[PDB]
Design a protein around this nucleic acid. Structure first.
Ligand SMILES: [Mg+2]
Ligand SMILES: [Mg+2]
Length: 47
RNA sequence: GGGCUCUCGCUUCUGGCGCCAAGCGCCCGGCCGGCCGGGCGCGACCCGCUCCGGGGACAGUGCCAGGUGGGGAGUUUGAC
């Protein structure tokens, strides 16, 4: 029944091994000046 | 099988290649147990409040006060 051709082909997201995937980067975004403002406004209000 | 600490998370003989996902699970869409065409998530751990670091309540900026200042400006440099 099974085809010998269907090999399972894992990828190595190691250092240098293979190129890395497009994962979520919201924490490091260069936000516009209005957003960065209102956020660190609320933070000052806390501090 | 259990507690504790640290490390790692897989690359050092060579002038090479390396993108646009494999696989699995779970869903169902048309046709007729089989065919054609679709979707999500694991695979690629979870949560957060400042992009990362270094300084830092001092440099610094604004206003007064003393000083220094032919680098520069203005003027003078007697009479018989
Ligand atoms: Mg002067
Ligand atoms: Mg004059």
């Amino acid at each position: 029944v099974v085809n010998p051709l269907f090999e399972k082909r894992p990828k190595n997201f190691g250092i240098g091994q293979d190129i890395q995937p497009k994962r979520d980067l919201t924490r490091f975004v260069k936000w516009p000046r209005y957003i960065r403002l209102q956020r660190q406004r609320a933070i000052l209000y806390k501090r």
